[PDB]
Amino acid sequence: GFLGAAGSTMGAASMTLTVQARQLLSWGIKQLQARVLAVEHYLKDQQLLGIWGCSGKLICTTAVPWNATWSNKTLDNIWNNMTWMEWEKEISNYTNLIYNLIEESQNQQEKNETENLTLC
Amino acid sequence: GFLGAAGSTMGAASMTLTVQARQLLSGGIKQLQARVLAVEHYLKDQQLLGIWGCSGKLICTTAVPWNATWSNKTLDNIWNNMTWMEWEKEISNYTNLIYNLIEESQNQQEKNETENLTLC
Amino acid sequence: GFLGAAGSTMGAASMTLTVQARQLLSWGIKQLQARVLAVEHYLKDQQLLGIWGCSGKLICTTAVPWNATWSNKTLDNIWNNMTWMEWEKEISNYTNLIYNLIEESQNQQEKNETENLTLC
Amino acid sequence: XXXXXXXXXXXXXXXXXXXXCXXXXXXXXXXXXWXXXXXXXXXXXXXXXXXXXXXXXXXXXXXXXXXXXXXXXXXXXXXXXXXXXXXXXXXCXXXXXXXXXXXXXXXXXXWXXXXXXXX
Amino acid sequence: XXXXXXXXXXXXXXXXXXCXXXXXXXXXXXWXXXXXXXXXXXXXXXXXXXXXXXXXXXXXXXXXXXXXXXXXXXXXXXXXXXXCXXXXXXXXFXXXX
Amino acid sequence: EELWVTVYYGVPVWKEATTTLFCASDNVWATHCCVPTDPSPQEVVLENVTENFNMWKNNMVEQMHEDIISLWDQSLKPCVKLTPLCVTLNCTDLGEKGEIKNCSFNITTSVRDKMQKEYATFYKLDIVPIDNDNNSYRLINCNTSVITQACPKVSFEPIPIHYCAPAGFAILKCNNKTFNGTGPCTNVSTVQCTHGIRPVVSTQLLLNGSLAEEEIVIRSENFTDNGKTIIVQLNESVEINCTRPNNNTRKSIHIGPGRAFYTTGQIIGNIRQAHCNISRAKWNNTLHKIVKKLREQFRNKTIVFKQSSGGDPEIVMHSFNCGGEFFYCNSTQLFNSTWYGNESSNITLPCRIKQIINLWQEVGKAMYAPPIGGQIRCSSNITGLLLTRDGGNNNITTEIFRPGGGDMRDNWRSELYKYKVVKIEPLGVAPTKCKRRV
Amino acid sequence: ELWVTVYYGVPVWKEATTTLFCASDNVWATHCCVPTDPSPQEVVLENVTENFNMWKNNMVEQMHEDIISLWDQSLKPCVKLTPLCVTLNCTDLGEKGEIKNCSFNITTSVRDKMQKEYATFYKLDIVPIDNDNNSYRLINCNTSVITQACPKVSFEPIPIHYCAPAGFAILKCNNKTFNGTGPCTNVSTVQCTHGIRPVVSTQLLLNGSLAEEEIVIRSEGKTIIVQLNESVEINCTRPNNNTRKSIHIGPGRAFYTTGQIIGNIRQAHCNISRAKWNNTLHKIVKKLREQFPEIVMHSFNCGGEFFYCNSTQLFNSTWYNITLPCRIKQIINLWQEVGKAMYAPPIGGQIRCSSNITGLLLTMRDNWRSELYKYKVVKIEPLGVAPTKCKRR
Amino acid sequence: EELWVTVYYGVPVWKEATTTLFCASDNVWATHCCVPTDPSPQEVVLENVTENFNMWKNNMVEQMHEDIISLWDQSLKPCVKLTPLCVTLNCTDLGEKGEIKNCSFNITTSVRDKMQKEYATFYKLDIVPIDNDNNSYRLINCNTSVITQACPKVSFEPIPIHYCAPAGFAILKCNNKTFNGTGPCTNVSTVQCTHGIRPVVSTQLLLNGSLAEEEIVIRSENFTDNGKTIIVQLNESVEINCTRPNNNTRKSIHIGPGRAFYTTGQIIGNIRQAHCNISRAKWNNTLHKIVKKLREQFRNKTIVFKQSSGGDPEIVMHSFNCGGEFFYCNSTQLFNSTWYGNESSNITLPCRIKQIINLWQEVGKAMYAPPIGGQIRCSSNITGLLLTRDGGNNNITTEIFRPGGGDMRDNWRSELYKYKVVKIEPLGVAPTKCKRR
Ligand SMILES: *[C@@H]1O[C@H](CO)[C@@H](O[C@@H]2O[C@H](CO)[C@@H](O)[C@H](O)[C@H]2NC(C)=O)[C@H](O)[C@H]1NC(C)=O
Ligand SMILES: *[C@@H]1O[C@H](CO)[C@@H](O[C@@H]2O[C@H](CO)[C@@H](O)[C@H](O)[C@H]2NC(C)=O)[C@H](O)[C@H]1NC(C)=O
Ligand SMILES: *[C@@H]1O[C@H](CO)[C@@H](O[C@@H]2O[C@H](CO)[C@@H](O)[C@H](O)[C@H]2NC(C)=O)[C@H](O)[C@H]1NC(C)=O
Ligand SMILES: *[C@@H]1O[C@H](CO)[C@@H](O[C@@H]2O[C@H](CO)[C@@H](O)[C@H](O)[C@H]2NC(C)=O)[C@H](O)[C@H]1NC(C)=O
Ligand SMILES: *[C@@H]1O[C@H](CO)[C@@H](O)[C@H](O)[C@H]1NC(C)=O
Ligand SMILES: *[C@@H]1O[C@H](CO)[C@@H](O)[C@H](O)[C@H]1NC(C)=O
Ligand SMILES: *[C@@H]1O[C@H](CO)[C@@H](O)[C@H](O)[C@H]1NC(C)=O
Ligand SMILES: *[C@@H]1O[C@H](CO)[C@@H](O)[C@H](O)[C@H]1NC(C)=O
Ligand SMILES: *[C@@H]1O[C@H](CO)[C@@H](O)[C@H](O)[C@H]1NC(C)=O
Ligand SMILES: *[C@@H]1O[C@H](CO)[C@@H](O)[C@H](O)[C@H]1NC(C)=O
């Protein structure tokens, strides 16, 4: 069920239910604010996936190297023995830096595709 | 013209899908509700085509087999005689069922794509 | 920074396309109108990109040839010796013509890609 | 589906000749068609028959009117008062005209065999 | 409507037999080939596009309105000789080889 | 066999639906309907399309009704409420000879410790006697209702109104020139906006409306149900020229700190009766043609027109807004005839003017229409007519028809009868021989 | 060599405050017009510990604000009793002196005429003035605007389900003995809360949820929730059979009062079973020993009337049928607002209520924390980033 | 050579546009501008960018004007309407000698059938004679307008506010320290929110505004058009200390069911004139620098700072809100000087208090400002002036300047002169050598 694997390890989640639940669209001011906010959250997540080159995917591999400064743990102790809550909430405060690096990489890739005529 | 093919057979009508797609895509309290609702309908259609493997296409072929229970008519007796107004009545009671099967098929496809990640 | 490349050349400013993109999506009646309008402008641009075969891209090439009547400058003079503001000021009366040509090209492309699938 | 061969029914000169495909696939599922398989010649299609008669006969063979009952699952065609031109074998083919997927009236997806119903 | 064309029988060689047309049938064209004493099978359809269930190397050059045959699959077993068809009008077909 | 589901987006289908339509135009209505209409609007004729229409269940009438009531309520809020005037009036006759009275009263003015004796002009229909003393009147209804002044800077003049569908919806129009209002229509077209409709308020005759394209069309939900309104759409209009001949001089009485009551200070010249002139020959020919069409639904019956059965002027008289003042005309010379069907080929209607108006049959509210100085003249086109058939009048080879319909929806239902709102459903599925490539 | 991988659909959340909407199966039926889920879903989150704090729960603050707004909007388009505030000539109607028959000179719809009208008032609704002892004014006359509730608008509480906007979720604590604060180790996710009845009272909590196992006392001996053995059903009544009267105080403005009382005048009262209350107090004391005018009476809305009952026979004991007299009041300041009051016009006939005591407040928002203590609203953050060995082409 | 059209989304270009701006603060302004501001707001300098500004065509000023009027209009709705007081007043002079009167009247109080004689204190400017008896007075314009009492718990105190653009829009700022309010600016930056602006209301002197960074800057739409307002922005403020020395004791009389009128019951001590103290040396140096700049604008002309043209105090005098009290100061000891250009290098202004005011020149509306108990003191910074040049001097060697400008927009253009709102146009097209597929 929705968030049912929240207590499971990171590599054990394998969930699609939490994005199906995010298909938000399947006196009067409060309802308009709730509907506008729901639309804004949907569009912001779609925009982020778009500019990262991740649109339409649930697992999106990028070309940004992992910096040990952000986390120096090995995969054996990230995808097992740890949950997504602990990872995102306690040991990751570099989210905006990483997102900026992802966006720079995607923009460089698209420009490189335009410049290199072997792909044209 | 908009809906000009409404009285045409399904075959001929399918060749003018851009007329309706273009007309519908290029869209105090009551006015805000009307604007929000128009946005919600646009996004609802985009979310539905998104969860299906159909985004970006006017004609999307799926992997779901056709069940004779829904309609046992041959293709010539569907595409070259009936109009879309009649077709969407003949199988009206199965619309949600078909839609669910399409989503399920895409989920299976996503898993098959997940099994084969880039360089992994 | 946001619009930091506004005074930079067209080539250099193409490295900042995500910087502006992140800033496009972000009494009582006035605030709802401001947020709904911001959403409508965002969607207007996303829809225009979806009419064209440019959805999910920051840089999107097309099959429409460049007409020398619109601009007869070299690629180096445009990309290395001109800003985007100057370019928009020069191409001020060809925007709708170019957009219509792009739409027509995409319609022809979609018509040609819809057929010849080899599937049936 | 099975690319069933055309049947032959040879005839005397100046007598009607005919052929039928006996297709394994449902006749109403595809725009089955007939062609004149003359030796050392173009396919010379007679009529790009639709899945339910209404054949768009070729100008070169405008008098052709191939048709068959869908219940028989056997497309058929005939040449009235057949003569030497009937030596060209009657070929069965399925047009690559998939419903609401292609609008071609040629580019045959498959050929079976032709009936050399000479007269 | 016309589809006259140059041709030669297949002989494990890179064919380049151009087809004529009464119209600029850049996409409304197809290619098919047949072995001696055999039914034809499509080699290409919609000009450049490869035919289903066939080697891509055997598809025609199909340079739009100046379409011509091609055979990168110049196999000794390439017994089937190609011909083009004009889909644009009147069911015009080439005799070719 | 070997068929798969294919999804098609942009399918030319729709379903019956309701939504909120926006108002376009090309003053209360100019202010509200601020959206301009498109120049050269388009209409797409849908060939081989049959669509069921039902003018009696058309939600567009309900929306137009609610929008009109809402605007009439909203435009009177920031305006003068005439509560200081629910006082005893002396009302010495001014005259005819009693139709207009000159009423004096003691009213506290903008200064709270100063009371003034003011004079105002009222019509007989605007006042009610208080006691046996003949010289004692109060306003027609200040017992249970609040009377709000019409607010002279707000103009209610009807202008063409275009109802337009929001994106995702479309309006289907019936192009059958003789369509009876219900059932299938075989000539259907798609529009984004309706034609211009004037929100004219009347009780018996439909003014400044549309005309039938070829013949007079009589529509009813059920012609054998005596409880339903019969709406007659004419194919040729009849001019009605209405005059209020009194030359009025307007006076302003200050009743509070920035709240002024407007009345007539004096009338110059003689007092004359307001009236409307309908050409006798045109009316006689129009009524004859109406009878010819009525005889198709009520076969071999005598068609008798009578005045309404009785009631307040709002029920039995023909009322309308002419020049900004509300007329109540005695439409008894128009509906006083007997026809048998073999009758092969100036009418002056007296009118009263009323100022305290309870519109929309509201409870506890009323409007005061202040007088307009000078004289009032207008010329309207009679384009339709509302008839009610007498019940319990069978077995006498005679039918009796009277003017007047049901509520205001019947006027707005005389337009908007050829239009329906549908929702567009561009997504659908169908079988074909291709399977998704994976 | 590790690479950044973006995952969409990560099952994580953070604390957030958003606007909640209500749903239900009358002001509440009109406001909570959204239908409920006919079969609500709940997902138990295994191996999840979540900190809760019922005293920092913004769902209670939103419920409070929604109630105040709904009461204000419901009474706004109604008759304002400003033509009153005149000297009343009151004579005892009779226990004697509780209800008075008051006469007064009131201007009617016509401004030129004064009429002498009669109305029935309770002692608590009027204040004596002068030294005549028959001269009275309304208790809140010179300090507030008294608005008559519309007789066609019902304020009867119904179950209300609070639902999160999509993209947010409500976490529920399923520990049956949870003390309202700190980590909860049995947590489930829901979209909507249970049905909460917006009952307003000052001492005893009537109707609503009941504790699943035992009596739970939450503080920081303040809020007590009664165990599965429901506390005393309290049977409250107003035995005086009244005939409603209506007079006009302006055009379109009708003032409602009581014209006559049929039969004898009797005092309103509530019946609490003695043995069950004694057992309830005993169990409450057992749990307490583990740790060691309008504000001194039990106020509630019964049948549309406002009862103020003397809760002194319930809380007068020392540890280690009970008929409580009740007064009826019409002019109230329900939310202690400055300058505003409601008249709550009388209802004819007799009134009988039967309510369930579900908790106690020992020593407002506290009436609703007892229902919302197990819920918190969180925001879902489906985007996560983690190292993998996979690299984009 | 063949080039193809390529679409770029996220292009750093914009066009002039007018949209609705929102407000962020950090009583009426904190409630209205209920958006927390960013700590350390960001600004991006746009290098090699020239942008044209026009402070007199800036729709941000029009929006600020509409927002201020709307906020004032909404703030006064939920409170006492002073209509029972438009009665004959029996007034007697206190103690100057007629500036403040003790007025008695017969008013119905909080009980509908009870009438009482009550006393209130009014300023001379708030009442007019009724008849020739030297005792009967009426409230000013009470018979033609509705006087609304300022809500007692609502503080109309100017505080810094920031105007912020919605998403998709940006505010460009001109950073040229001597920019004259029009034309190109070559030191341009992008912000999301404006600097903190105080919505101070005044008629002649600009108080608590921004100072010029380097020099006094004098701006005018057209300097040769005598009908335009001249806005003088100072680079050094002048301190103005305004006092109401009367120790007023507040009284509250009830006129309805919780409808109370606030007045002064008594004054403790003597009655003294309200006044403002401006340092003489600072004002004289300020005028010296202003006239120097005007001479640069008006070459070889004698400049005479005559006082205002006369007429109604609302235009003639310098008015302001000091602690809730509305002061009208003569401002005639300032100006009234002649400068020739060859020069080199307290002032106590009498003030009147007016309780019934109409700030927005509305028809049929007025506000009553209740008295504040105790003595009132304010210290404001004069950061600019509004001057109007007299016409008819085209054929002489002397120009005449007077205090006073146009409507309230002139007090906001003095701050919103370096900002413009633009719309972001993220799409554009350009030729390249890469074809699709
Ligand atoms: C019927 O009434 C109309 C007006 O309602 C009369 O028309 C007027 O006639 C006079 C001369 O008789 C003209 O001076 C006016 O200008 C006309 N009015 C209009 C509006 O055109 C008409 O004459 C009357 N008919 C009869 C037979 O008396
Ligand atoms: C305690 O009070 C209850 C009412 O609250 C009494 O129950 C009523 O008893 C009478 C008989 O005297 C019945 O007619 C009623 O129907 C009962 N009411 C209900 C709601 O059931 C009860 O009898 C009282 N107990 C004692 C011991 O007197
Ligand atoms: C209050 O009234 C209720 C009924 O309205 C009483 O509860 C009922 O008591 C009778 C006694 O014979 C039982 O048979 C019913 O089953 C009870 N009803 C329910 C719903 O449980 C209750 O006892 C009364 N309370 C008091 C204090 O007298
Ligand atoms: C004018 O442009 C210059 C750059 O050429 C700006 O220089 C710095 O800008 C930052 C912006 O945050 C300021 O914090 C620095 O203090 C500026 N440097 C100096 C030496 O002042 C400059 O701010 C721009 N503005 C002005 C008014 O000159
Ligand atoms: C919770 O932990 C237990 C430990 O035994 C494990 O079996 C169970 O699968 C875990 N639940 C989830 C949802 O990961
Ligand atoms: C309508 O039907 C006729 C045949 O009755 C046909 O010729 C015509 O093309 C059809 N119209 C459309 C739009 O398909
Ligand atoms: C329609 O109008 C014409 C005049 O345009 C008239 O002759 C005809 O009689 C009218 N039709 C009916 C049915 O009245
Ligand atoms: C009404 O006035 C118009 C003005 O053009 C005139 O033509 C018409 O005949 C008049 N009709 C009557 C009945 O007076
Ligand atoms: C946790 O909550 C679930 C909710 O269904 C319940 O079934 C389970 O028994 C609870 N566990 C404990 C230990 O209370
Ligand atoms: C005004 O007061 C300030 C202190 O508040 C003082 O610095 C300044 O010198 C005073 N100036 C005058 C002119 O009174």
CB of A84 sitting under 6 A from ligand 5: no
Considering its fold, how many domains does chain C have in total? Answer: 1
The answer to whether residue C120 is domain-embedded is: no
Whether the Cβ atoms of residue D4 and residue D92 lie closer than 8 Å to each other: yes
Domain that holds residue A96: 10-119
Which of F240, F242, F272, F346 to probe ligand 1 with, by most ligand atoms within 8 A of CB?
Answer: F346
Percent helix, strand and coil across chain D, each to the nearest 5: 10, 35, 55
Distance between Cα H237 and ligand 10 center (Å): 12
Task: Tell me the structure's resolution in angstroms, rounded to a single decimal.
Answer: 3.1
Do the bridges between strand H43-46 and strand H188-191 make them parallel or antiparallel, or are there none, so unpaired? Answer: antiparallel
Residue B36 lies in a domain: yes
- Ligand 10: centre distance to CA G290 (Å): 66
User: Residue F25's CB: how many other CB atoms inside 10 A?
Assistant: 18
Q: For chain B, what is the radius of gyration of the CA atoms?
A: 18
- Cα–Cα distance for residue pair G315/G306, rounded to 1 Å: 22
Only one residue has tokens 């007629």, namely H98
CA distance H248 to H267: 5
Residue B46 lies in a domain: yes
Q: Cα of F169 to ligand 10 centre, how many Å?
A: 69
Asked whether the beta carbons of A81 and G390 are under 8 A apart, the reply is no
What are the pocket residues of ligand 4 if the criterion is a CB atom closer than 6 Å to any ligand atom?
H 43, 45, 175, 177, 187
Task: Give the span between the Cα atoms of A110 and C61, in whole angstroms.
Answer: 10
Residue F91 phi/psi, 5-degree rounding, is: 45, 65
Mutate which of B3, B8, B19 for ligand 6? The one with the most ligand atoms within 8 Å of its CB, which is B8
Phi, psi of H52 (to 5 degrees): -85, 135
Count how many Cα atoms sit within 13 Å of the Cα of residue F108 in the half-sphere of its side chain.
12
The C-alpha R_g of chain C, in whole angstroms, comes to: 18
At C49, which helix (H) or strand (E)? helix C29-51
Beta bridge partners of H170: H422
- In testing the pocket of ligand 1, which one of F244, F272, F277, F381 has its CB within 8 Å of the most ligand atoms? F277
**Torsion sign (Cα): F124, F127, F128, F131:** negative
Elucidated via:
cryo-EM
Query: What is residue F297's three-state secondary structure?
Result: coil
The DSSP secondary structure of H364-406, one letter per residue, reads SEEEE-PPPSEEEEEEEEEEEEEEEE-SS-TTSSEEEEEE--S
Q: Residue C76 corresponds to which tokens in the numbers above?
A: 């180096």
Neighbouring chains of G at 3+ CB pairs under 8 Å are A, B, F, H
The string over G52-75, giving b where at least 16 C-beta atoms fall within 10 Å of a residue's C-beta and e elsewhere, is: bebbebebbebbbebbeebbeebb
Residue A5 lies in a domain: no
Helix axes C29-51, B29-51, angle to 10 degrees: 40
How far does the CA of residue D114 sit from the closest CA of chain B (Å)? Answer: 25
Q: Give the number of the atom of ligand 1 that is nearest the alpha carbon of residue F377.
A: 20
Question: Is the distance from CB of G322 to CB of G273 less than 8 angstroms?
Answer: yes
Nearest to B40 among A25, A28, A58 (CB): A25
Whether residue G10 contacts residue G144, with contact meaning beta carbons closer than 8 Å, is answered with no
| Residue whose C-alpha is closest to residue G31's, from G155, G150, G147, G207 | G155
Pairing relationship of beta strands G253-262 and G233-250 according to DSSP bridges? antiparallel
For strands D32-37 and D45-50, give the pairing: antiparallel
The alpha carbon of H181 and the centre of ligand 4 are apart by a number of angstroms equal to 19
Length of chain G measured in residues: 393
Q: Give chain G's contact residues with A (Cβ, < 8 Å).
A: 1-14, 18-19, 21, 41, 43-48, 73, 165-167, 169, 189, 380-392
Paired sense of beta strands G145-147 and G340-342, if any: parallel
Task: Tell me the C-alpha distance between G80 and H36, whole Å.
Answer: 39
Instruction: Give the three-state DSSP class for H334.
Output: coil
Environment class of A52 (CB within 10 Å of its CB; exposed 0-12, middle 13-18, buried 19+): buried
Identify the DSSP state of F29: H
Facing residues of H280 across strands? Answer: none
Task: Tell which of F3, F5, F34, F67 to mutate to test the B interface (max B CBs under 10 Å).
Answer: F5
Tell me the sheet residues that pair with F376: F244
Residue owning the nearest CA to atom 22 of ligand 2: G321
Q: How many CB atoms neighbour CB H183 within 10 A?
A: 12
For residue H193, report the distance from its CA to the centre of ligand 4, in Å.
18
Q: Is the CB of A8 under 6 A from ligand 5?
A: yes
Rounded to whole angstroms, the Cα distance separating E33 from E85 reads 11
Nearest to A59 by CA among A19, A108, A26, A88: A19
Q: Answer whether H91's CB lies under 8 Å from H102's CB.
A: yes
Which class for H201: exposed (0-12), middle (13-18), buried (19 or more C-beta within 10 A)? middle
What is the Rg, in whole angstroms, of the alpha carbon atoms belonging to chain F? 26
Residue B7 carries which DSSP code? G
**What's the distance, Cα to Cα, between the start and end of chain F in Å?**
20
Q: Is the C-beta atom of B8 inside 6 A of ligand 6? A: yes
Report residue H361: phi and psi, to 5°.
55, 45
Residues with C-beta less than 6 Å from any ligand 3 atom: G 232-233, 235, 271-273, 354
- DSSP letter at C103? H
Dist. CA D13–CA G309, nearest whole Å? 117
The DSSP letter of residue D40 is T
DSSP states of H258-323: T-EEEEEEEEES----EEEEE-HHHHHHHHHHHHHHHHHHSTT-EEEE-----SSHHHHSEEEEET
The 3-state DSSP class for residue G30 equals: helix
Angle at H232 between CA H226 and CA H233, to 5 degrees: 155
Residue G312, number of CB atoms within 10 A of its CB: 11
Chain F residue numbers with beta carbons less than 8 Å from the beta carbon of B63 are 4, 435-436, 438
Cβ atoms < 10 Å from Cβ of H153: 8
Give CA B31 to chain center in angstroms: 29
Give residues with Cβ within 8 angstroms of F90, minimum separation 6: F103, F104, F105, F135, F136, F137
Give the residue carrying structure tokens 């008289």. F317
**Most C-contacting residue of F6, F434, F438 (CB-CB within 10 A), to test interface:** F434
Contact status, residue F191 vs residue F171, Cβ threshold 8 Å:
yes
CA–CA gap between residue A62 and residue A106 (Å, rounded): 8
Which tokens belong to A61? 């591999």
Tokens 């938000």, located at residue: A24
H180 alpha carbon to ligand 8 midpoint, in Å?
A: 66
Q: What is the DSSP letter of G164?
A: P
Backbone angles phi, psi at B112, to 5 degrees: -70, -30
Is there a domain that residue B100 lies in?
yes
CA-CA distance, H174 to H271, in Å (whole number)? 50
Residue B120 lies in a domain: no
One-letter amino acid identity for C110?
E
CB contact under 8 A, G111 and F87: yes
Proximal ligand: closest to the CA of B5:
6
**Domain covering G3-77+154-383, topology:** HIV Envelope Protein Gp120; Chain G (2.170.40)
DSSP H166: P
Task: Extract the tokens encoding H154.
Answer: 């609502």
Give G132: exposed, middle or buried? Use CB within 10 Å, 0-12, 13-18, 19+: exposed
What φ, ψ does residue H419 adopt, rounded to 5°?
-120, 145
Please give the Cα distance from A11 to A83 (Å, whole number). Answer: 8
Q: Which residue, chain included where needed, has tokens 């169908």?
A: F430
Atom of ligand 6 nearest to the CA of F46: 13
Closest residue by Cα to residue G158 from G305, G308, G347, G23: G23
Q: What is the CA radius of gyration of chain D?
A: 13
* DSSP code, position D59: G
* Positive or negative: CA dihedral G258, G261, G267, G270: negative
Phi, psi at C15, each rounded to 5°: -85, 0
Q: What token pair was written down for E27?
A: 């996409």
Going from N- to C-terminal start, the domains of chain H cover 4-77+155-427
Q: Is C119 domain-assigned?
A: no
CB-nearest partner of C115 from E46, E50, E51: E46
Q: Which of the 8 DSSP states describes residue B118?
A: T
| CATH topology (fold) of F4-77+155-427 | HIV Envelope Protein Gp120; Chain G (2.170.40)
DSSP-assigned letter for residue B40: H
Of all residues in chain F, the one with the smallest CA distance to C116 is: F434
